[PDB]
Amino acid sequence: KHNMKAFLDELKAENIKKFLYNFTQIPHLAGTEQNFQLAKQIQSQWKEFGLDSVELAHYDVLLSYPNKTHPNYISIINEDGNEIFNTSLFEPPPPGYENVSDIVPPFSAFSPQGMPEGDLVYVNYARTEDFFKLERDMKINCSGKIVIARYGKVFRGNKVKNAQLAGAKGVILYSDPADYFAPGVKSYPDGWNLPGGGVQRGNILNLNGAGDPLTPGYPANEYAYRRGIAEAVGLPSIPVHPIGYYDAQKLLEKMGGSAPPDSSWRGSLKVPYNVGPGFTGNFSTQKVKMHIHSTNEVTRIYNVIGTLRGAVEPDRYVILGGHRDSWVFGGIDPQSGAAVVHEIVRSFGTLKKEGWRPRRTILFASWDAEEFGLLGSTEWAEENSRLLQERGVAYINADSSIEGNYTLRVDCTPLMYSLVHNLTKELKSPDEGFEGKSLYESWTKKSPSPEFSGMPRISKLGSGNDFEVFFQRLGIASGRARYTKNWETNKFSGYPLYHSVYETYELVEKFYDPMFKYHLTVAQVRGGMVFELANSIVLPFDCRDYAVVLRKYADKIYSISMKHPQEMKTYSVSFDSLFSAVKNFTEIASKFSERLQDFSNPIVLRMMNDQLMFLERAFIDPLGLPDRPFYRHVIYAPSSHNKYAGESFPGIYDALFDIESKVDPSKAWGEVKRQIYVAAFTVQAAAETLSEVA
Amino acid sequence: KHNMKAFLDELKAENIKKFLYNFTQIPHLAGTEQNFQLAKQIQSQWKEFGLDSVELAHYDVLLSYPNKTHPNYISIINEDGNEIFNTSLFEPPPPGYENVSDIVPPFSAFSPQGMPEGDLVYVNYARTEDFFKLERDMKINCSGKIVIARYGKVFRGNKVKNAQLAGAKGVILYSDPADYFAPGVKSYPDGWNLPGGGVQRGNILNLNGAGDPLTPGYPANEYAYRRGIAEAVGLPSIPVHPIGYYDAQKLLEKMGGSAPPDSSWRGSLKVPYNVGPGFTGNFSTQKVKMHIHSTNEVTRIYNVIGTLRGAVEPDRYVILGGHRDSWVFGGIDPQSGAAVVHEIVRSFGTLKKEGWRPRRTILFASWDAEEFGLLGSTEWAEENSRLLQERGVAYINADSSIEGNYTLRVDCTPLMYSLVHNLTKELKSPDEGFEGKSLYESWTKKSPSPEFSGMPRISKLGSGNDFEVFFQRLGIASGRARYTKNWETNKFSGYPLYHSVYETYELVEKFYDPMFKYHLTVAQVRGGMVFELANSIVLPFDCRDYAVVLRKYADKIYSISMKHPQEMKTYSVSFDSLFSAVKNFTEIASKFSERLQDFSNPIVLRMMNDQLMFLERAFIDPLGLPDRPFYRHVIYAPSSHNKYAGESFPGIYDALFDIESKVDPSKAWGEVKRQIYVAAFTVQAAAETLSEVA
């Protein structure tokens, strides 16, 4: 038989291992010749595996690279101008790789050039609330200063935006062991911990969904008109560089001024963690100086697009996508994910050679330049927007398969909650102590839902990965899944060797998943979801699950507003219309489910599958959110304070944020009310797409 | 049998006459109690006629009305301040109506209040080129002056915008007999000509598709948040009033200054048509003074929405819509159209009571507040945007059925050219001398195509009527049709009694269409188009017809650019990518037609009908045109100089318009190139929706 169980049984742990090894021997940086060569390999093997067509789609986008003969580094300089201390030029390469070329040294992609000189201020994680504490409560002014911040808690792009608006003239980012160094485990190569010479690469853009900085709205094709650099989207205006904790100890050990305001400002190093500004008396005339010479340039990138045509609904698309570009070797991020995609293509191809086809079309993607701002996914979606919005059923992401070995992590649209629950009940747990039990049972036990007994935790989608254009711009139902670490004990700053040279095949095989059983479990979840979405006669979305979280989100935003009872009376601020819309959605969705359970008629079937497909689409507002035109979904956007986190009713949340500080309360509460109107209308319009059509 | 011929044969001239008489006995001004009463009548009769459901949809929108106890008028004042001349307070009412109440006096809807005083300048039709001639060639400065302009050639809203930007402090509009008074025909009530006391009402907004000035983007429902007046869309900033040619002769007869620059500036009255500024020497200290006291206020309006459910594709919508509100009696505009809609509903209802249903759903609409800015259609479409864009097949408009008695006028999307040609070949000509001939033959003979021998003229859609939100905002295929006057001899300023008290039932029955045979022909065209669109198994759109006009539009915009050969060399301005896209569209559309002619399979059928439905939709750009976010179609927009006229490749046209006057040629030619990029990309993306889907 050709059913889901045939599909699932053909996947093998041993194939995923082989592919991960094949993908991680050399660096595959976006825009380099070796990442083009890997794209041509993937295209050739996806055709051999059986897909009906496989093509490269290329784009010419803005990337960023260091200057090979003019290295980036930081100094302490004395009164006379001698550089008495210099940060490293490279990470000590790991055992066996000490002769590999083309390892890009640590840098912050898209930093402007400069050589600023001045006094240090320590700003903790550089969050919005950390700058409020500095300027409002401690009275410390960052204008004209170089800020040093530890990585962790929020996207590094938001840290840089926050430092810029406080008037900083440069930023220094470092990894503190309190966040990235765990209890009793050794540094690479003896364990999975971060060494004092290790450094986290990463871009520092604020794109808010735009894609290529030079071509917002349109694909970066051969005849594209480009903005000049000064009008480009999302570039930072001050120099930025990342360092390891050996180098950071040298820069912090001399800091004077105010004490840390409390113990949540202290890391793990043997230093006071004083806030500054400047150094203590003996070294009060010393200074910090940055040297940054990176350049921005328009470089070609390549997506691989494979197609497996549907037998019945060839004009309905189910997409499995993940990126292929890496900062260095990509042992976890992304090749642990791309190796799983490779095995999933191979199994669907096995079925196809025996004569099977799915009901709906499945599209497979190897994205480029994800690490430089989701550029490959976003340019392809800009090019194909009209097809994706009238034909796109769902998008399943496939970056890193593991960031731990404790239990499953799922973030998705409410429309897939029921699909995920049913599929994980039919899968075996790979966890020790759950031999012979379901993945549902082990996940539910190790990661309980906050709200409901006997259910597992499923989070909201945030951003910082390739689903952003499909979900928050186009309104296609999306999901992602991987193995992760324990929720208690989790500091939410990532795995220690994230975006480092130490992130290798050996990291994975020795310390994360020696048997490749977690990789295999994640391949069954991602591939099982794609199989049901593309083969089930009725789309596997449950509209009632949207109705439950919308009531939760409305209670939450109402409670934020109720902290200001006098202003709600003065300006006549009512949430009545939002709760009314949510009630109507609950009722109409309940009636829709009853009709979906009663009906031999394919037209009623296409009609009702189309109501299910366009329900996510219904939450899109073509005018976008305020000042963020490419974030169009009214229920979900990336937090304005942290691109990695999801925010619910983001229009209303942002109109309410820090409202008590605004100068014209009347105008600020007018905008709250406008955002309440937009959200009520949009929820009611979404509900009406599920009424009888005529 | 229940086929198109049964439908067409059930329509009767005598029914249309009766309904026109019923709709034109009293005024039906938007927002008044009598227009609400007519809406309740229409709803009740559409249910009796057989429709499955009929509902009122109401909205609270900004309208404008004069002050009953504080009349608008204009004066000539002397040195001492005595008003030596006063314009009329009302039009002399016609025979038999001299006791009807609630006739709104002449006014310009949405004029601000004021009483400005100053010297007159005559500006011809107040077009863009007339202000260029005044300021650039004649050196006459309109700053601080009251301008007087004749109606005709362009939408009165564009005239007011042009006067404002020249610095005028008020505007006076009048009807000149050279435009609105024809050869050897008598004034009402003895003929169809305009009397010297007649005046044209009309709004003077510049909405650019927004709808209700207070709620751009969202419906004006019960909980809507409203902008304050100062942030409202499209309101004029100087007082404006309309007058008849007796009053205009008094204001022009004393004008001094420069002579008219040529005979195209002279009308028909016995005056010099001097441009000013001010009066000749004897009366040089006299002045003109306006008195305007109209008020803007939020008023409820009511659309009637009738539904006839489809038997096979109930989730596909074919819409027949036209307005019901009138300035006074609405003898032509709009009730000559609404009476035709009434008879079309009655005939479809006859078939339905004998057991028939159309294949697709048909929606019938009686719009409100069209005369105040397309407000009823636009608010309903804003409310129902998600349903209309995923389910809307086509929209057929139904305002005035006659503006003449010479031949047919059709303006529509290229996708309906073939449908119109085939339907008119099956219809009888009502023209004298074409007894026993087809409507196609008489139309083709009296109104030949400019391009192709043996074909009739079909124009581009412009704007100034209720199709604007469906076509240029949402991208639903649209069309309109009516009887009109002879193309040569046509001055393009409208029928003489347009928006006047003299526009009555008697006007129509005595001078336009005594037998109601032109009304009947127009009902067969509008109703035949709706019948084919809603019942034909394959949608009746031909994509190849889009491919032919796109090449024509590309040749046209290229020729405008080639007037500047040195600048095209300096800035490397190429149209190669646009011609490449148009070539690709021609080829892909040709292959699509071949597939459409070969295929018992309903899924292939739904798939291919969906490619035909979404092809118009494919020309929509979600970011809109520059500064006009609600004009989203990249091929067609209303002219920026004349809302009534259509412009092709409007992004490029406007970047090129008057480019030789721009201060920074480099920036101006950069924007031309950007607009070439957007148009090529959009044409190619549209073509790709017609490729095989997988």
Ligand SMILES: *[C@@H]1O[C@H](CO)[C@@H](O[C@@H]2O[C@H](CO)[C@@H](O[C@@H]3O[C@H](CO)[C@@H](O)[C@H](O[C@H]4O[C@H](CO)[C@@H](O)[C@H](O)[C@@H]4O)[C@@H]3O)[C@H](O)[C@H]2NC(C)=O)[C@H](O)[C@H]1NC(C)=O
């Ligand atoms: C959720 O669904 C329900 C449908 O079950 C929907 O109910 C609607 O609520 C509005 C109230 O905002 C109703 O509007 C009324 O319509 C009548 C005519 O049918 C009008 O006469 C009413 O106007 C008068 O009263 C107002 C209120 O005091 C005055 O301000 C106004 O000036 C008038 O004097 C009023 O407009 C509507 O009829 C119901 N529809 C029903 C019951 O079918 C509700 O709106 C939905 N929620 C959302 C957020 O959409």
Ligand SMILES: *[C@@H]1O[C@H](CO)[C@@H](O[C@@H]2O[C@H](CO)[C@@H](O[C@@H]3O[C@H](CO)[C@@H](O)[C@H](O[C@H]4O[C@H](CO)[C@@H](O)[C@H](O)[C@@H]4O)[C@@H]3O)[C@H](O)[C@H]2NC(C)=O)[C@H](O)[C@H]1NC(C)=O
């Ligand atoms: C209309 O349809 C045709 C399809 O039949 C489509 O043709 C495409 O044109 C572009 C040219 O803009 C081709 O792009 C090339 O792709 C190859 C790889 O396949 C590249 O190597 C080429 O790049 C090199 O050469 C460039 C030109 O000098 C250099 O600037 C560049 O730096 C490289 O050195 C080039 O990008 C594309 O392959 C064809 N596709 C085909 C034939 O399948 C055409 O674009 C369509 N028109 C529009 C407006 O879309």
Ligand SMILES: O=C(O)CC[C@H](NC(=O)N[C@@H](CCCC(=O)N(CCNC(=O)c1ccc(F)nc1)c1ccccc1)C(=O)O)C(=O)O
């Ligand atoms: O340009 C961009 O938008 C992103 C490009 C690139 N993307 C990327 O590296 N993404 C990784 C890592 C995303 C960050 C992350 O996984 N964590 C791990 C913790 N997980 C969560 O915070 C988390 C967030 C939302 C959610 F619903 N569940 C868990 C994290 C958080 C804060 C700081 C540092 C790392 C991924 O999605 O796997 C980058 O972030 O530099």
Ligand SMILES: O=C(O)CC[C@H](NC(=O)N[C@@H](CCCC(=O)N(CCNC(=O)c1ccc(F)nc1)c1ccccc1)C(=O)O)C(=O)O
């Ligand atoms: O607010 C709005 O947008 C419009 C509200 C109202 N709409 C209205 O009255 N529309 C009428 C009249 C439209 C104007 C018109 O028909 N002509 C008659 C000449 N016809 C054309 O110009 C024409 C335009 C385009 C085309 F493709 N074919 C003929 C005209 C033109 C210029 C000045 C005065 C009148 C209609 O569409 O039947 C108004 O214009 O005040």
Ligand SMILES: *[C@@H]1O[C@H](CO)[C@@H](O[C@@H]2O[C@H](CO)[C@@H](O)[C@H](O)[C@H]2NC(C)=O)[C@H](O)[C@H]1NC(C)=O
């Ligand atoms: C990764 O696997 C690929 C595919 O097996 C290897 O590429 C093949 O290499 C052999 C020997 O050089 C050639 O005969 C084929 O032409 C290649 N196939 C392709 C490109 O599809 C590749 O060498 C492996 N890489 C590593 C680092 O082991």
Ligand SMILES: *[C@@H]1O[C@H](CO)[C@@H](O[C@@H]2O[C@H](CO)[C@@H](O)[C@H](O)[C@H]2NC(C)=O)[C@H](O)[C@H]1NC(C)=O
């Ligand atoms: C997940 O599984 C449940 C339980 O099997 C499915 O719910 C059942 O669906 C059948 C078929 O329509 C109904 O007759 C039952 O009454 C349902 N049981 C319930 C709601 O308790 C559910 O549909 C599945 N979810 C999917 C496929 O998305």
Ligand SMILES: *[C@@H]1O[C@H](CO)[C@@H](O[C@@H]2O[C@H](CO)[C@@H](O)[C@H](O)[C@H]2NC(C)=O)[C@H](O)[C@H]1NC(C)=O
């Ligand atoms: C226009 O036609 C309508 C419908 O025939 C007339 O309205 C009806 O009037 C009669 C007599 O007053 C009543 O019995 C009905 O209740 C009305 N029907 C409705 C409102 O649907 C109306 O009087 C006619 N108007 C004119 C001006 O002749």
Ligand SMILES: *[C@@H]1O[C@H](CO)[C@@H](O[C@@H]2O[C@H](CO)[C@@H](O)[C@H](O)[C@H]2NC(C)=O)[C@H](O)[C@H]1NC(C)=O
């Ligand atoms: C208008 O009428 C023409 C002529 O009847 C239609 O074109 C024919 O359509 C049939 C059925 O598909 C073809 O087999 C013929 O070859 C066509 N003749 C041609 C193209 O010369 C045309 O389709 C009609 N237009 C519509 C329905 O929109």
Ligand SMILES: *[C@@H]1O[C@H](CO)[C@@H](O)[C@H](O)[C@H]1NC(C)=O
């Ligand atoms: C790299 O640095 C050198 C200076 O040592 C400079 O001349 C060269 O142009 C730089 N490369 C760039 C900017 O690409």
Ligand SMILES: *[C@@H]1O[C@H](CO)[C@@H](O)[C@H](O)[C@H]1NC(C)=O
């Ligand atoms: C740091 O580098 C600079 C430039 O190469 C050099 O002049 C200086 O001596 C170095 N300082 C130390 C302490 O090594």
Ligand SMILES: *[C@@H]1O[C@H](CO)[C@@H](O)[C@H](O)[C@H]1NC(C)=O
């Ligand atoms: C911070 O310092 C600079 C002056 O060097 C000044 O422009 C800014 O206003 C200061 N802000 C304060 C003191 O709040």
Ligand SMILES: *[C@@H]1O[C@H](CO)[C@@H](O)[C@H](O)[C@H]1NC(C)=O
């Ligand atoms: C893998 O599993 C073991 C078993 O608990 C755990 O102690 C170890 O830390 C895990 N490895 C990683 C990288 O978390």
Ligand SMILES: *[C@@H]1O[C@H](CO)[C@@H](O)[C@H](O)[C@H]1NC(C)=O
């Ligand atoms: C109409 O005019 C009178 C003045 O004669 C004024 O008092 C009244 O308020 C006006 N009505 C309005 C502005 O609605």
Ligand SMILES: *[C@@H]1O[C@H](CO)[C@@H](O)[C@H](O)[C@H]1NC(C)=O
């Ligand atoms: C015009 O009207 C005003 C105000 O009613 C009046 O004072 C004046 O006499 C009138 N002028 C003439 C010439 O009738």
Ligand SMILES: *[C@@H]1O[C@H](CO)[C@@H](O)[C@H](O)[C@H]1NC(C)=O
């Ligand atoms: C028109 O007149 C006014 C002065 O009253 C002036 O502001 C404007 O610049 C003038 N324009 C000219 C003379 O071009």
Ligand SMILES: *[C@@H]1O[C@H](CO)[C@@H](O)[C@H](O)[C@H]1NC(C)=O
């Ligand atoms: C109606 O038709 C006659 C016949 O040519 C024509 O002379 C007359 O002017 C027409 N009426 C109107 C209003 O155009």
